[PDB]
Structures are given as structure tokens and as C-alpha cells.
Amino acid sequence: MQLVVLTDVVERLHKNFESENFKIIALQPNEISFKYLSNNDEDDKDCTIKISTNDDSIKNLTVQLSPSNPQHIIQPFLDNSKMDYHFIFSYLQFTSSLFKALKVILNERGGKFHESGSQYSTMVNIGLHNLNEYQIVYYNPQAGTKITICIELKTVLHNGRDKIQFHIHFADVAHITTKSPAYPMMHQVRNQVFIRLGNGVACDPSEIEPILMEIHNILK
Amino acid sequence: MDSIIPAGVKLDDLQVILAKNENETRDKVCKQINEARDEILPLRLQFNEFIQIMANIDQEGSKQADRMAKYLHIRDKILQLNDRFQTLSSHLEALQPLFSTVPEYLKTAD
Amino acid sequence: FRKEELLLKDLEIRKLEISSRFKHRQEIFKDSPMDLFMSTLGDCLGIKDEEMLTSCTIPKAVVDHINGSGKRKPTKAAQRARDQDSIDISIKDNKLVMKSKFNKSNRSYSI
Amino acid sequence: YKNKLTVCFDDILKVGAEMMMQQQGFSQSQQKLLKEKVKLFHGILDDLETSLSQSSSYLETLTAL
Amino acid sequence: HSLIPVAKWFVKFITYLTQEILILINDPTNKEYTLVHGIFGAKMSRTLILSILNEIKKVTQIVAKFPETSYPILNESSTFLKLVLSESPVDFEKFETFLVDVNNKFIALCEQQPSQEREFSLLVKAEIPPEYAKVGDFLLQYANNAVISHANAAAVYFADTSGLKISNSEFFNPEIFHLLQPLEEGLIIDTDKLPIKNRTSKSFSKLLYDDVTCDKLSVSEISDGKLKRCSRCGSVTRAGNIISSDKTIVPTSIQTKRWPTMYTRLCICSGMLFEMDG
């Protein structure tokens, strides 16, 4: 029964995770160690799935994520929410590119001593509300300024069909006037970016990772 | 409860006091900040659960006693919400003397 | 066609009763947002005031004055005021009483 | 921050007070008011968490130094 | 009271065209969204909506001038009519000036160069001839600053305008929305060749929304067999029949002959309406 349910899970994943980075590292009766991201390490499991089997099927499929994997910040929300496993896999495949982009962003600041006295006053950390949105705010204690970038999952009607796209935009609180000392960089971002309707930027996940770096190119 | 850090004492005197006693107060404040960090998340989780309950009020209701049970449950929920607010207020006021040195240090370093 | 006339009259009486109800409620329990929320929500359900529970205790001065049966006699002006109001209001043992004056049946307030 | 957490949970009931007042459909103004109230509650919770983390880190660095 | 469900589709319609304005600005080379050009190009439609907005103002002014006073409980329908107009995501006055300015600009262009095919193009072709490529650029640039400046840009883009029943793909069920036989065999198809689940008129179309009063169809109205289908456009409507008490202002057994009785035998597209088989 354990093997049959594992085979069913693997078949469903193959149906839902058709990507060139999908691979299984270690197979265990009680846990799953498979790699679906672009991590170079062979034995590092990007996603860990614990197997809790019952007389007929798996009781619960708990998703565990490696600390090196940037996706570990969503672990408590996955743990406390009993959502469909297929839906969880769909969300993971839909947001893997976003996770890679934010991994690059956080590793830019997380680099070790490069023998440069460029002690930047801006620190990048991830703000979290729920599974529907992921938020990034730039902490500057020296200048006393904030740079909030919210990424929500909003549905938009497209050719008689509703689609979900990443809504990368500045919050409605960001009605920053020209008088702010840090306003130059928000204004530059607005001028050079603001599918753009003036405030929001809806993007295809297959194309979020270059455009976000285009936003991050100004940031870096 | 216990006032390890006296009120009105200067920062340097607190440094001298902290330098000794083998860091029992350091252990206590580390435990307090750890439990505050481990309490931050469950408050968010249960608050989202309360929002979900409120939004789904028009579902799974067919008997009047069901409303009695559900609304007694929610009133109890906000009961432990106010209790947890009081507990976190106590936690922050316990660390209030410790945080009181930060404004003085910042203004002296200015 | 007296049926529709009495339905509409009952609806107007209900809306004015609800108006007096919330204008009195917002001031009697102004100090407790919890109590106001649970009271108005239970009355939206249709719960009689004698069954629901209160976390806080109200002062006894308002209870003594609203009835006047104590040492201080009720004011004749207060009598006229309570006559002109559409709802008979009184508190018995830290709980008020609410009863419809036209329909004695179990008027369900549920939505 | 002590007053903000108290008023925010008092205001979410206050924001709803007019919402069930009409109940005693839904107005879009009240719905967006509730949305901004809950999102600002989450934001101030995150800000307080960040402030606590920064204060803690200052605590260890000053104790070490 | 019965006009309220119609007004919901009336507001839901004007939002779809305004939504396409924002989309077309970013990518003007998309040929799949050329319908937006023809709608504004139609000359009587701009006047027709203005007349609708005129009588809407007249009705509201008359209702304000002559409100219901004997029974306050009956004022809900009158009050709701005022509320739905004010609570609309886009102001009607700003949208009223939008179509008015288009008419004047499209009249002076006729005097600049005489042409009669443009009248056909703006009404039927829903396209602009290549010789008038400069005219197409004017629609994209001017529409942004005219009305959108007074509305919420973020809200209209994400607004739920789906279910308008405009395209044919969302009229018939997806099982049968395809060619079934080769052109050699002809265009008319015998019923016996249809799929077993698709051999009844009930499975031909989406029986979810109404087409005359623009109201949602409940389970009771679906199952009573008193609804009608148009043999021409596939529309489904329960017009010409007494409405249930739950759809009235107050639940009652009084039977009232409502305006749907105009379309008892003739559909909206001049087609015939027949009792839907169960």
C-alpha cells in the first residue's frame, strides 16, 4: 500500500511537475527527497515530503523545505493549512521562478565580506501575510525610510476566462510626494516601469524572473 | 513581575551590573525574546482563522443551537485574544526597562 | 386588503423599534465593544435577552432610576419621556427586558 | 505600539459596527475599510516583529561589547 | 424593482469596454481586440447611450421630484436606483462626455475627406481602413486621459466582468461547440448523429443566466419547465410567465403580469420562442 500510494503521488507529480529540473534524490518509506529547483548540490533536497500512510492512503502529506532552499519561509502556512496536495504542487510550480528570483535578491545581500566598505543601509527581508501574497520591504534605519513591494495573487478576466497573475506593485499607502528624501528611487522605478496600468504590473510567471531583475537592476 | 532592571538607573551602571552574575538575566531575556518570537506567528495564524470563520458565517448553519455553540466559541476566541493581549503587554513591559537604555544610547551617540 | 396593510404597519413598527433599540444600546453599553457586538449579533439571531450572558456588570443607579420603585420617586417628566418612547425599557438583575408590544408571538429576528 | 494593537482590534469591531448597523447587500466603502484595516494590522505586526529582532540583536552586540 | 437586475448588466457592460481601453494602450498591434474600435465608432450607439443616460437622469429627477410618501417601506426600490448609479465604479457623467466628444471629432473628419465606407466600417466591420490608420491612433491616446483619470485604474482591470454572454463560445456547451460533419455531408445535421448526452435542447446551451431581465436563474426556475429557448441565437429566457414570490418585493401569492410578457412569442433577435422540453 505504501508503494502504491507513492507511485500514485509520483505519477501525479509527473503530471503536474513537467520541468527539466525535476528529479528524485533519495527514496525512503517515510519521507520523500526530490529536487525540482536549480540547486547545484546533488544531495541537497529542495523539497521534503513526509509519508504518513494509512490502511488505504496517505493520511497527510506535509511539505518540508530545506533552509538553503529560499522557500522555507512558507513552511508554517503550509503546515497549518489543510489544502489539497495537488493545489500545493501547482502553487510550488507556479512560484518556483519567483522563489529563485528572491533567492538571488537575498543572496546579493547575504554575500560574505568582499573587502568593500559599502555598508549599505538597506536590508532586504520578506514580509508574509498569507499564502495568497508575498511581500518584500526594504529596511533603512539610517535614512528612516521604507520600500514596500507587495506581490499578490489576483484574478483577471482574459478572453472570457479568469487567470491568476502575480500583481507586483507599490501599495496604495505609497502615495509618496516629491518631498521625500528617498522618493527619487521610487520615482525612477515608476517612470521606467509604470502590462502596466500606472500602479500595478501583472506578469507571466515564465517572465517574472527577468522583469523582476529589471526592477532589481535599478535596485542593484 | 520581578524587576531585575531598576528604574531610573543609567546605562553604564546597567553595563557594570550585566558584566557579572554569570548572565542569568541574559538567559531570562533570551528566553523571553524567544517566546515572543514563537508567539508572534500563532497570533497571526489564529487571527486568520477568525477571519475565515467570520467570512464563512453563512455556511454549515441549520439549527439555532448551532448558532449558540458557534457564537459562544467565537466569544471565547476573542476572550483568549484579550488574554493574550494582556500577556504580551506584560511581556513587553517586562522588557521595557531593558529597552529604555536604547533611546539614551542613541541620543548620547548622536 | 387588510393583510398587506398590517404587514407594512408591522414593518414600520419594527424599523422604529430597531432605531430606538440601537440608539439606546450604543449608550447603555458604550464602554464594552464586546458586549455591544455580542448583544446586537444575538438580537440579529433572535436570542431573548434573558438567555445571553454578560461579561461586565452594569451600575445599579441606572437600574434604580429607570424604574423609580426605590427611595427616589420617578419624575413625572421622566414618566412622560418613557411614555413618548416606543419601547418599554427596564433592567432586572443586571439584565434588561425586551418585549414586543404589538405581536406577542416568537418574533424571529434571524436573517 | 501598545496602543496600536488595542485600537486595531477595537477598530475592526468599530469598522464592522456600521457594517452590521445596516444589517441590523454590503457597501464597498465598508468592505475596503475592513480590507485596509486587516492589512495594516498585519503590517504593524510585521513591523513590531522586525523592531523586536533589531532590539534583540542590539542586545547581544552591546552585551558582547 | 424588476429594473434592478437589468441595471446590473447595464453597468457590467460599460465596464468591459473601459477595461479594454487600458489593455489596448500597451499593445496596439493586437488584432484579436479590434472589437473595441467598432463599438465607439457606431454613430447611433453613442446617441442611444446618451438617450439612455438622459432618461436615467429624467427618471431620477422625477423620482426625486415625486417620491413615494404613503408607504416608506416601498421606497427601497426607488432608493436603490439612486444608490446603484452613485456606487458605480465609473461615474456616468464622466463617461457621458466620453461618447459626446467622439461624435464631434468623427463628424469633422467626414468634412475633411468625403467617404461613405467609414460609416459601414464603424458599424459592421468594426475596423478602421488602412487609409485611415492615423484615425486609429487617436482613440488610443485620447481615451486614457478623458475618463480613466476620474476612476480607479486598479479596480477596473481586476473587476469581474465575466459572464456577459457576449461571445458565442459561452452560449453553447463546449461539447457541441465545434463542426460535427464535413462540408460534403452538408450543413444540416440529423438529431440521431448528436452525442447521447447532447441529444436534448437542455444540454445545448448554458442554462445559468437570463437574457431579457438579466437576472440569475435559480434552481426552482430551471426545474419548473416554464422557461423558453430561442431557436435562432440559442438564448434562454423565462419571459412571459408569472415570476415566483421570492423575486418580488414582498413574498405574496398575488399574480402580476410583468413586462416579460412582450416577448412571449418573439425573441430578442426576432426569433421564435418555444417551451423548453424537460
Q: Which of C47, C48, C56, C108 to mutate to test the interface with B (most CBs of B within 10 A)?
A: C47
Instruction: Return all residues near E127 (Cβ < 8 A) that are at least 6 apart.
Output: E34, E37, E38, E121
Question: Quick one: cell of A161?
Answer: 476566462
Q: Which of E26, E36, E156, E157 to mutate to test the interface with A (most CBs of A within 10 A)?
A: E157
Which H or E run contains E16? helix E3-26
Q: Which of C34, C41, C46 sits opposite B71 (nearest CB)?
A: C41
Say which residue the cell 548620547 belongs to. Answer: B108
Phi, psi of E198, rounded to the nearest 5 degrees: -115, 30
SS (H, E, C) chain C: CHHHHHHHHHHHHHHHHHHHHHHHHHHHCCCCHHHHHHHHHHHHHCCCCCCCCCCCCCCHHHHHHHHCCCCCCCCHHHHHHHHHCCCCCCEECCEECCCCCCCCCCCCCCC
Measured on CA atoms in the order A205, A207, A213, A218, is the torsion positive or negative? negative
**What single-letter amino acid sits at E54?**
N
E161-189 b/e (C-beta count within 10 Å ≥ 16 → b): beebbeeeebbbeeeeeeeeeeeeeeeee
d(CA E245, CA E241): 13
Q: Please give the torsion angle defined by the CA atoms of residues E133, E135, E140 and E145, in that order, rounded to the nearest 10 degrees.
A: 160
**Could you say which residues from 25 to 64 on chain D have a Cβ atom under 8 Å away from some Cβ of chain A?**
36, 39, 42-43, 46, 50, 54
Provide, for chain B, the percentages of residues in helix, strand and coil under a 3-state DSSP scheme, each rounded to the nearest 5.
80, 0, 20
DSSP state, E172? B
Q: CA nearest D20: which of C33, E145, C99?
A: C33
Q: Which residues pair with A151 in a beta bridge?
A: A134, A168
Chains C, A in contact, 3 or more Cβ pairs below 8 Å: no
B85 touches chain C (CB under 8 A): no
| CA distance readout (Å), B36 to A3, A4, B79, E71, E124 | 43, 44, 20, 59, 68
Flag if C12 and E250 touch (Cβ within 8 Å): no
Gaps in chain D (C–N > 2.5 Å) come after which residues? 24
| CA distance readout (Å), C30 to A108, C25, C26, C27 | 54, 8, 6, 5
C34 touches chain B (CB under 8 A): yes
Using an 8 Å CB-CB cutoff, list chain B residues near A80: 45
Q: CA nearest E238: which of E229, E250, E247, E246?
A: E229
Question: Quick one: cell of D21?
Answer: 448597523
Flag if A127 and D43 touch (Cβ within 8 Å): yes
Flag if A195 and E161 touch (Cβ within 8 Å): no
Which H or E run contains D48? helix D28-64
Q: Cα distance from C25 to chain E (closest Cα, Å)?
A: 24
DSSP state, A43? S
Phi, psi of D21, rounded to the nearest 5 degrees: -60, -50
Using an 8 Å CB-CB cutoff, list chain A residues near D54: 141
Chains touching E by CB (3 or more pairs below 8 Å) = A, C
Using an 8 Å CB-CB cutoff, list chain A residues near B48: 130
Instruction: Return all residues near E199 (Cβ < 8 A) that are at least 6 apart.
Output: E191
Chains touching A by CB (3 or more pairs below 8 Å) = B, D, E
Phi, psi of A151, rounded to the nearest 5 degrees: -125, 105
CB A136 within 8 A of CB A149: yes
How many Cα neighbours within 13 Å face the side chain of E26?
12
**Could you say which residues from 35 to 64 on chain B have a Cβ atom under 8 Å away from some Cβ of chain C?**
64
Q: Cα distance from B88 to chain D (closest Cα, Å)?
A: 9
Strand order in the sheet with A123-130: A123-130, A133-140, A145-158, A161-169, A200-203
Question: Quick one: cell of E232?
Answer: 435562432
C41 touches chain B (CB under 8 A): yes
Flag if E153 and A162 touch (Cβ within 8 Å): no
Size of chain E, expressed as the number of residues it contains: 278
Per DSSP bridges, beta strands A58-65 and A123-130 are unpaired
Size of chain B, expressed as the number of residues it contains: 110
d(CA C95, CA E88): 45
Q: Cα distance from C91 to chain D (closest Cα, Å)?
A: 22
A130 touches chain B (CB under 8 A): yes
Chains touching C by CB (3 or more pairs below 8 Å) = B, D, E
Chains D, B in contact, 3 or more Cβ pairs below 8 Å: yes
For residue B99, the chain D residue with the least C-alpha distance is: D55
Say which residue the cell 436603490 belongs to. Answer: E80
Say which residue the cell 408607504 belongs to. Answer: E71
Flag if B85 and D52 touch (Cβ within 8 Å): no
Using an 8 Å CB-CB cutoff, list chain A residues near E22: 197
Q: Cα distance from C29 to chain B (closest Cα, Å)?
A: 17
**Residue B21 exposed, middle or buried by CB count within 10 Å (0-12, 13-18, 19+):** exposed
Q: CA nearest A144: which of A182, A183, A189?
A: A182
Q: CA nearest D15: which of D34, D29, D42?
A: D34
Using an 8 Å CB-CB cutoff, list chain B residues near D48: 40
Q: CA nearest A164: which of A173, A175, A152?
A: A152
Strands, E, within chain A: which ranges? 23-27, 31-35, 47-53, 58-65, 123-130, 133-140, 145-158, 161-169, 200-203
Q: Which of C19, C20, C22, C110 to mutate to test the interface with D (most CBs of D within 10 A)?
A: C22
Q: Which of A157, A161, A199 sits opposite E161 (nearest CB)?
A: A157
Flag if D52 and B33 touch (Cβ within 8 Å): yes
For residue D39, the chain A residue with the least C-alpha distance is: A129
Chains touching D by CB (3 or more pairs below 8 Å) = A, B, C
Q: Cα distance from E72 to chain A (closest Cα, Å)?
A: 40
d(CA A79, CA A64): 9
D12 touches chain C (CB under 8 A): no
d(CA E44, CA A183): 48
Using an 8 Å CB-CB cutoff, list chain D residues near B18: 63
